[PDB]
Symmetry: C2
Subunit: 149 residues, 2 copies
Amino acid sequence: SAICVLEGIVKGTIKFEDIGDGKTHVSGKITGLQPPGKHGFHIHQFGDYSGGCMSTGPHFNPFNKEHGGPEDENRHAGDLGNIVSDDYGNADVNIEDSQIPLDGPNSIIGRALVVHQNEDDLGLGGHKDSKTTGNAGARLSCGVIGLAA
Amino acid sequence: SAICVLEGIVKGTIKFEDIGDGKTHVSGKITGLQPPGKHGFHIHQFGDYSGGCMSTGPHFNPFNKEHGGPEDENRHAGDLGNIVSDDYGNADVNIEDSQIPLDGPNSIIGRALVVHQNEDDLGLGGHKDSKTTGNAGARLSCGVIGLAA
Ligand SMILES: [Cu+2]
Ligand SMILES: [Cu+2]
Ligand SMILES: [Zn+2]
Ligand SMILES: [Zn+2]
């Protein structure tokens, strides 16, 4: 098991459980996520927010692919897609994925979870930065991913 | 390299560098650390502060020893001893140690750094809890230890 306490504007505790396989299940309640709609949600390379969310670096990309959506083969391991907030800024996270293991050479422990101001276009927006960040825009919050009981 | 952004009352960014060996060097500037004098400083088992610093659990103890000081053989790997704050609450951390590696089966990545209200008696206080926590008292702040560039 692993766990992430979000720091920044958007608040919440995100748990990670080996499910497993194979797959890990990521969940938790998020609040303060404005405006309502879809927001990019990604594991980034470094678990360092000493300099703000900017210091977590680029998307976690161990298999050296382009940015995509969680269902594409051509996809960063850290590409969890979008989560959705309602009119009050509340969101429930409930995602299953098989490129974010809790051990092994490509584990996510000690990396960072990041949630974004905009929708992640899943690499299909035809923007300058579509194929790297999904054009997801500003980093609202981040948390270091930690070993949990 | 690894890094810790302190959350709680006491503020600061603590860096961890393989030095190395062998040994890792831990440093950074801390503020808000009252009252002046010695405060226990320890790596704890879980990088989880979802429930407050309490959720980081006991001292990191991979080699299954009793609590001691950093120079004892009979010592938790997480036992970094005491740091010192001046009259204004400021402290400079500068410690070298060889039981807190940044990789391997006994790495500290994804665990937690914790700083305490009291002096750690290094297992010599003859208190109920001397040989487990050093009688270090309340957890003022904690940070998850993260992978850094
Ligand atoms: Cu991101
Ligand atoms: Cu401690
Ligand atoms: Zn990506
Ligand atoms: Zn100890």
